[PDB]
């Protein structure tokens, strides 16, 4: 059997499209790691994790690039965030150690979530319970779409938060007018 | 299975039995210390902070003892500490502190290793006569009052001590 | 609160049916329509408010007059009603919360509030056009001028 | 389909059914092709209806037919002194146009939701009546179509011979209203025209 993606390729054998985002790419064979603790539940909270901060970073950008930043927060004026973050560090730095050590005790729990996850089985890669509007109690079809929409629009993000933090870090000017010097630079 | 608070993550099943139990040790604490020390610990804890918090915020709205002692004079609630232990009034209640402490020394010892049956926390202190005859369930909120007001005057002493430090301002930062 | 009882306030009369473009209704559950049910009238009762007090005093520059001890005071008055109307809805209730058994605009705090199924009807639709009229005041007043243009 | 053949045979008997482009064999919500058929009949039937009421509604607003009395708070009459009736539409006020405009859409509202539609079991053009479908509060004395009842008794095969000189006449003004319009913005463009229509020369399909 053929993976999806890739159908020169044999299909990896631990991906058998139970995942969301399940299409058969892993020429690599990542998925048959299991030494370091690392495995495929391993893998797939990094990817699901990777997924939800990527996409928070970019509307975390697009907010304050158009609105501005928050109230109490003026003192930014950057349009580039890579720069943006060293004002709001120059003025108000206990809100940063605020919401980074906040992060420290969060993720640390979801550190032994995980790998109490792993060795029992009463939870997925990545699921923390977050349903509080209750979209996974009904039209499991519907939900499985959710599923997979949270990983396409988190995969997207990927490189999307990527991109702008590295040309935010070599541009110094801002995403989205890194991409209004690009349309004039390459139009036809 | 289950534990409340952290619902992706399962039940530490030494929780159950003690009363301000929500299901939230992700460190596993209880599964290297008993609970009753760390119960008694939680609740020592507490009572302090609920002192602390209480005589920080008294000092700094002006409250001051009558009649106030010349070396007494002159002090914030940061500024007391350092103050008072050149005047001695730090090594006074250091004194009756370190009195009660061995005492208590005794207690946890015998909580832990003797088997007292002794509650964590318990003292006998109750001249004012609550839980006079009340039941299981009525000496359960009660107790579960001291300790949520005794968890959140730690938080609640944290952010008064530190913030103090940072102004040296007017009361509702100091 | 099933879904079709949800979408069964209010009428469908001005539109000709359910008025759901994008689908909303139907990716969710029951559970998940009694937030959008319940967060429909609290849009609507907050922007009716809001919309008179931006004539009861003709607007931006009324809040910046007000001090920090002024905008922390009622910023949290508002909390503790917030947080005693998701508490009623808990644990004073027949049914329950409105996201478990509870009807979404009954809005349990007692005081506050002082032939209705009508009026739970008429709610909706005069909160409706007060949010699109409060989003009026803050774009056809503020921030570019040749909006509405009324 | 069977039967739009039947009403375009009746209307005329040399050109039996007329389809160049043949539209009325398409769909265009993905209703059905017996439901756009339907909406193709509605839209030609309002189409020739408005237009009908625009080419007596032009040669009185052109001529001077200013009628007492002018209802309005301080004056300003209804602007026949320029004349030139696409002139005259653009000096009535800005907000007199939306009373216009909105009251139309209530009865362009009212033929939709009302009691049956044309996208369905049909008759299109049949606007229903203010008295029945239970929508509007007020309630109003007249009817659209027969506020006097003239004429009520009439039989089917005396109706149904209506609608047939009613698309001929409305197809008529429809050609008859565009080509007063068309000799406002371009002279020329209808040959038998000429000099007597004033090149009104701004925009003719713009409101405001
Ligand atoms: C990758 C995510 C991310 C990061 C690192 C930042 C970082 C920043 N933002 Mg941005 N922002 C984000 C996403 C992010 N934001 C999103 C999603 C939005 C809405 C679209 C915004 C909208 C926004 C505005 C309008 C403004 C900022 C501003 C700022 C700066 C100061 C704010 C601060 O330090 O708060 C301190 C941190 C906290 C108060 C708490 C953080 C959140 C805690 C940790 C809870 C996280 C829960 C998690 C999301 C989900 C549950 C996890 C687990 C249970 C599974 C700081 C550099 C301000 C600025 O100065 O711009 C220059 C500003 O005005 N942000
Ligand atoms: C993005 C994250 C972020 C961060 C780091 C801050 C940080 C701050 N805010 Mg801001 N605020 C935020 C989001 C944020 N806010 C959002 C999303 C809103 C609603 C739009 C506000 C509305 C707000 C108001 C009305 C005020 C602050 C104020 C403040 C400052 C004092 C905190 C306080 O009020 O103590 C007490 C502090 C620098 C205060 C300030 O100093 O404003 C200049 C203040 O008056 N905030
Ligand atoms: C998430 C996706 C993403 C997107 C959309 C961008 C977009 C951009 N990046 Mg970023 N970047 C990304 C991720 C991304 N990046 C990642 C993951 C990294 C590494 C961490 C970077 C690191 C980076 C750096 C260091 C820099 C950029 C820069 C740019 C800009 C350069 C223009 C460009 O090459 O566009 C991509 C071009 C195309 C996609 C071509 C379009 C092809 C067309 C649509 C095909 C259609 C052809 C058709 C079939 C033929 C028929 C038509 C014909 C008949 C006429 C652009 C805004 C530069 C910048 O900031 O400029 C100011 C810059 O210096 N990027
Ligand atoms: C965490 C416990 C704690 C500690 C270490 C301190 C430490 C201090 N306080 Mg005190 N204070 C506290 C709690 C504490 N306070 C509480 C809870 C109150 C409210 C009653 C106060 C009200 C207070 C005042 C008005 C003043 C101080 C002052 C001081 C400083 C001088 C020494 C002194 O003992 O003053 C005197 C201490 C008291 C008046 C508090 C007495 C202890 C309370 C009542 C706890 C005892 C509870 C217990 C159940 C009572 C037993 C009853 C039983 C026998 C029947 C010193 C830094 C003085 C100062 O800062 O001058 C610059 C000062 O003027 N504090
Ligand atoms: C609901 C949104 C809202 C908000 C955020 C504000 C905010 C403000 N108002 Mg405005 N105002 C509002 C609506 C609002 N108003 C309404 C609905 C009225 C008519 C009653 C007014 C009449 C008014 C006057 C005459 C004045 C202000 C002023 C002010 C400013 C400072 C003083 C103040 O806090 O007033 C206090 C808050 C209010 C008066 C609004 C209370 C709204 C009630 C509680 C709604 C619920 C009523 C409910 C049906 C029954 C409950 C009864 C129970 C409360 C007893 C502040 C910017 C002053 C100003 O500086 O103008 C430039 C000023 O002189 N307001
Ligand atoms: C085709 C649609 C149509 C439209 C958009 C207009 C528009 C106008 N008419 Mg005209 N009119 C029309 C048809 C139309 N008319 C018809 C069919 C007649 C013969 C009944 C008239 C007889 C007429 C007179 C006597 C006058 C106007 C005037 C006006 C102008 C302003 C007052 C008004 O709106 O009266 C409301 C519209 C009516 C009273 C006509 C009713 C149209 C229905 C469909 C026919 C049923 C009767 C405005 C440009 C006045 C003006 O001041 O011109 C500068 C004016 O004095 N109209
Ligand atoms: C070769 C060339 O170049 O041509 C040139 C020259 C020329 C001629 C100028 C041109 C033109 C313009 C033209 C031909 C315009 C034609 C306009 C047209 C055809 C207008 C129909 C109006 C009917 C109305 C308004 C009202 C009905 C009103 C009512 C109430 C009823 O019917 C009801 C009724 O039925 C019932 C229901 C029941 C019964 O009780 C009887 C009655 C009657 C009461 C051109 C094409 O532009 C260019
Ligand atoms: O042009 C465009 C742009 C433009 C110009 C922006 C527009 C606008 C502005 C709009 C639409 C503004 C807002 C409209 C809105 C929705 C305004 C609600 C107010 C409710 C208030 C003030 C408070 C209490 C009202 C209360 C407490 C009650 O009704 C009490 C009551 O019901 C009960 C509770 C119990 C009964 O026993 C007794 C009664 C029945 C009395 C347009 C015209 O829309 C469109
Ligand atoms: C049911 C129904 O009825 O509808 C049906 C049936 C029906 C009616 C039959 C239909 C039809 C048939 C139609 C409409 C056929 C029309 C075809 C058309 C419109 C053909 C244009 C040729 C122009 C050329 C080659 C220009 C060369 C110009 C050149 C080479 C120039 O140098 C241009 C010039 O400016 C410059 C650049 C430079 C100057 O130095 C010189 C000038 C000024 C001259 C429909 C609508 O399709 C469908
Ligand atoms: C050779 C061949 O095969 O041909 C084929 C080709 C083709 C295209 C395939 C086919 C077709 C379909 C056709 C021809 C469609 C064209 C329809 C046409 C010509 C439709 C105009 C309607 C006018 C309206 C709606 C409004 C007037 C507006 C009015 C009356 C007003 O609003 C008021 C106003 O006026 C006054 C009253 C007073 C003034 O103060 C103000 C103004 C001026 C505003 C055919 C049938 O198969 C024939
Ligand atoms: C902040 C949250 C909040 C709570 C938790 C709460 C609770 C109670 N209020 Mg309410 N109240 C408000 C808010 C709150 N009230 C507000 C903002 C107003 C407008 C100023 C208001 C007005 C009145 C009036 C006129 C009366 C009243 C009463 C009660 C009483 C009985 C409940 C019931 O009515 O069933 C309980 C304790 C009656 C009373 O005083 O009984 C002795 C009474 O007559 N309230």
């Keep these: 059997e053929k993976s999806q993606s890739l159908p020169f390729m044999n299909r990896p054998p631990l991906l058998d499209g139970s995942m969301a985002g399940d299409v058969g790419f892993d020429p690599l064979g990542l998925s048959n790691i299991d030494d370091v603790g690392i495995d495929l539940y391993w893998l797939r909270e990094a990817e699901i994790k990777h997924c939800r901060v990527a996409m928070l970073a970019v509307v975390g950008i697009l907010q304050v690039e158009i609105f501005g930043p928050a109230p109490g927060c003026e003192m930014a004026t950057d349009k580039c965030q890579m720069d943006a973050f060293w004002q709001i560090w120059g003025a108000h730095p206990q809100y940063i150690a605020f919401g980074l050590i906040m992060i420290m005790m969060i993720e640390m729990i979801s550190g032994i979530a995980t790998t109490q996850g792993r060795e029992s089985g009463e939870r997925a890669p990545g699921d923390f319970g977050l349903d509080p509007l209750g979209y996974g109690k009904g039209d499991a079809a519907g939900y499985a779409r959710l599923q997979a929409q949270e990983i396409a629009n988190g995969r997207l993000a990927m490189f999307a938060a990527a991109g702008e933090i590295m040309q935010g870090c070599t541009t110094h000017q801002g995403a989205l007018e890194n991409l209004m010097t690009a349309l004039r630079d390459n139009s036809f | 299975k289950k534990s409340q608070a952290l619902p992706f993550l399962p039940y530490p099943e030494n929780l159950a039995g003690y009363v301000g139990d929500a299901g939230f040790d992700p460190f596993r604490f209880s599964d290297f210390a008993p609970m009753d020390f760390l119960r008694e610990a939680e609740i020592k804890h507490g009572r302090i902070c609920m002192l602390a918090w209480l005589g920080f915020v008294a000092v700094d709205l002006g409250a001051r003892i009558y009649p106030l002692p010349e070396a007494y004079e002159g002090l914030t609630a940061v500024t007391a500490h350092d103050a008072l232990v050149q005047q001695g009034a730090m090594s006074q209640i250091f004194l009756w502190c370190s009195v009660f402490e061995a005492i208590s020394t005794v207690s946890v010892i015998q909580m832990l290793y003797e088997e007292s049956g002794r509650e964590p926390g318990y003292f006998g202190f109750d001249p004012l006569g609550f839980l006079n005859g009340k039941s299981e369930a009525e000496v359960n909120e009660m107790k579960l009052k001291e300790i949520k007001n005794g968890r959140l005057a730690m938080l609640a002493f944290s952010g008064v001590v530190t913030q103090a430090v940072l102004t040296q301002g007017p009361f509702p930062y100091v | ?150 | 389909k069977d039967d739009l053949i039947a009403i375009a045979e009746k209307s005329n008997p040399v050109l039996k059914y007329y389809d160049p482009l043949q539209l009325g064999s398409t769909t265009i919500w993905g209703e059905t092709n017996s439901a756009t058929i339907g909406f193709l009949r509605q839209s030609e039937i309002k189409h020739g209806r408005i237009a009908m009421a625009a080419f007596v509604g032009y040669i009185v607003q052109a001529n001077g037919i200013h009628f007492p009395w002018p209802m309005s708070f301080d004056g300003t009459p209804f602007p026949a002194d320029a004349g030139s009736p696409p002139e005259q539409w653009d000096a009535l006020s800005d907000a007199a146009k939306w009373q216009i405009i909105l009251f139309i859409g209530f009865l362009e509202w009212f033929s939709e939701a009302a009691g049956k539609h044309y996208m369905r079991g049909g008759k299109p053009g049949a606007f229903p009546n203010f008295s029945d479908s239970d929508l509007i509060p007020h309630p109003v004395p007249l009817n659209l179509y027969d506020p006097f009842g003239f004429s009520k008794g009439k039989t089917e095969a005396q109706k149904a011979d209506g609608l047939i000189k009613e698309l001929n006449n409305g197809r008529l003004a429809m050609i008859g209203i565009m080509g007063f319009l068309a000799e406002q913005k371009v002279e020329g463009s209808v040959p038998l025209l000429k000099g007597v229509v004033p090149h009104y020369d701004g925009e003719v399909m713009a409101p405001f």
């Design chain 3, 1 to 150: 609160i099933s879904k079709e009882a949800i979408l069964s306030s209010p009428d469908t009369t001005e539109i000709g049916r359910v008025w759901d473009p994008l689908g909303l209704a139907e990716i969710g559950s029951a559970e998940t329509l009694a937030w959008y049910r319940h967060s429909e009238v609290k849009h609507g009762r907050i922007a009716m408010a809001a919309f008179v007090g931006w004539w009861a005093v003709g607007g931006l520059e009324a809040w910046d007059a007000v001090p920090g001890w002024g905008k922390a005071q009622m910023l949290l008055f508002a909390g503790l009603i917030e947080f005693h109307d998701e508490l009623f809805h808990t644990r004073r209730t027949e049914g329950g919360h409105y996201l478990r058994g509870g009807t979404p605009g009954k809005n349990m705090v007692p005081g506050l509030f002082d032939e209705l199924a009508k009026g739970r009807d008429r709610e909706i639709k005069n909160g409706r056009l007060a949010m699109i009229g409060v989003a009026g005041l803050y774009c056809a007043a503020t921030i570019p001028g040749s909006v509405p243009l009324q």
